[PDB]
Amino acid sequence: VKKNDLFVDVSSHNGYDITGILEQMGTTNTIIKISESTTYLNPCLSAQVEQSNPIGFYHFARFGGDVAEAEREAQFFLDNVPMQVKYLVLDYQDDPSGDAQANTNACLRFMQMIADAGYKPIYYSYKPFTHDNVDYQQILAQFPNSLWIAGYGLNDGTANFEYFPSMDGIRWWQYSSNPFDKNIVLLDDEEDDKPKTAGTWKQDSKGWWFRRNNGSFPYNKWEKIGGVWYYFDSKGYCLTSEWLKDNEKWYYLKDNGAMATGWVLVGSEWYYMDDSGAMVTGWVKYKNNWYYMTNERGNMVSNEFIKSGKGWYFMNTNGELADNPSFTKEPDGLITVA
Template identity: 30%
Template structure:
C-alpha cells in the first residue's frame, strides 16, 4: 500500500470519531498485505502464520501516478503460492488512480484481472481496488468510476473489494452506494499509532458499516497489519454472492420483486438527438458502446442543471450549440433487466440501457 496512508494516524481529536466499543463483529481473523518489496517464500509467510496471521492480500499491480501506464508486481505469483503453502488465505489488490473517469476505471479493471490471472489468483478470489490518490472533486462521479471498476471485477468472476483510508473516503467517496451494491466489501485503513502493533486494538475499530477488513497498522512485524471481521477470503464461494440480490444479473428473472434505480450524479449532456419524432439526451459514459437508440434518455425525464447540480430556471435545451449542458435524473426508475455491468431501466415509459455503475438499485 502507498505511504499516503500515514496521514490516517490518529490525532487526539480524531480518536473520538471512532467507536469506543466494537459491535456486531464475530470471530476476527488477523492478516497482512504485501507488495514487491516484501518476501515471497513459504518461510517468509510461515513466520507471519506463527504470530497469528491467517490471510494475505497481495499487490497484483497498478496504473496511474507512480505506477505509470501499468505496473505488474513481479513477485505476485510467488507470493500467492507461498502464502497458500504456508496455510494462509489469499486475495489481491490493484492500485487505481483513475479519479472520476469511467473509461479509465474500466481499463484499470481489465489490467487488474489480467494481473490476477497471470499471478494465478483463482476465480472467486477477492480483488480490492486501492483508491487513495487522484480523486476528482465530485463524490458521486468518483463513486461511479469506483463501481465501474468493481462491477468489471465482479463480471470477470472475482469478488470486488474497495480499499482506502478513512479521511480520504470522507472527502471523496460515497460509501453508501458501494455498500448498496456490495455489502461487507470495505477494507479501510486507520492507525492509532505508527509504532509496532502485534495485534489490532479492537476498542478503536472504525465506526463504519460494511467493513470487511480493517488495516490497523503499517508496522506489524514490518508489514501492514489487518484484521478481517466479516467472513473470510473463501475462494470457493461464487463471486455472484458478493452482490446484493437486487443487483445480481439473475435476480430480475428469479424473483417477482420489482426493483428501482436511482441516480445521484450530475451528468454531462454530450449531445441531444431526435429519434422517431422524440428528443433525447445522451451521456456517452453512461451508455453501452456502441451508443445507439438503446441508450437514448427522453428529454422529458431530465432536469437541466449547472455543473454543481443546481436546477436551472430555464429548462429548454440549447441544442448542440457547443455550450456544455448538464442534467440530473431525479426519479425512481423501474429496473427491467440487468447484467453484471449494465442495467435496463424504464425512463418516461421507454426502456434505456446504461452502465450499472451509475445506478443505485434497491
C-alpha cells in the same frame, strides 16, 4: 476466512521472501498486489503467491474520477490474476478527482467489472479519504459488506480497538502497517451456495430430531445440517443451551441447537469458541473488554474486566463493578473485534 482471522497484505515493498512475516503473524493468508494504473505489475507476485495462501489480490487505482480509465485499469488487473481467489480489491487512496460522485461512479464501475468476472469486489481505503472523496454508502448499496478499511491508531503493531475506524459495511480492518500490513477479519466469508438440508426437522414432546431423507436420524453424534453443526443425544434429539465435552474440548450448543463459534453469551457470561467450536481458555479481548476464561473440571468461568478510561475493572457474577481498576497494562492474550 472467519471472524477474527488474520491476514497480511504485501507488495514489492515486501520483497521476494515473505516467509518471515507470515511466521511472525502466525498465518499464511495473504492479499497480494498485482497491478497499478494500466502498465505496472508487482514483480514479486509469483514468489508471494508460492510462499502463501492468497485469499485475494489488489490493484492500486490511479483512475481518480474517470470511469473509462477505471475500466481499463480493471481489465489490466483482471488480465493478470494468476489464480482463482474469492476476492479482488480496489485500493483507492490517491489521486481522487475533485468530484466525489465521479470518483464513486468510477469505483462502482471498477467493482462491477470485478463482479462480472466472477469475483467478490472489495473497496480498500482509509476513513477520512473515503469521507472526502467517495460516497461509500453507494458502494455498499451495490456491493454489501465490501469495505476494507485502514486505521492504525498509534501503529505499534497491535490491534487497538479504541481506534477502530467506524464505518458501515467493514469486512476487514487493516490495523497496523508496523512492520508490515496487518489485518483482522470482521465478517465471515459469505457462503458460495445454498446449504442442503437432506431431510426434515421434526419436533416432538421431548425436542427436535432430524429425519434424514432415508428415514434414519442422527443420534450420539455430531452432524452438519443446512451448513450448521448440531449435536444429537442418544435418543436423537439435538442439544439446546448445553455445554458438551467431546475429546477433551468443550462445545456450547446454542438455544437454536447450532454449535457456537466465536463469542457466545451463556446466560449472562461471555465465552469464546474457536472456528471449530472448541472453547478457548485464557485471556481473550472482546473489543475493549478483557476476559479470562477457564473450564477446569467443567467449572466454566468467565472472569470479566470492563475498560473505563485507562483501567480495566473486575465485574462480579451479579454485575457490580469493582471500585478500582484491577489493571492498566493489558495482558498479552488473543485480540478479537467481533
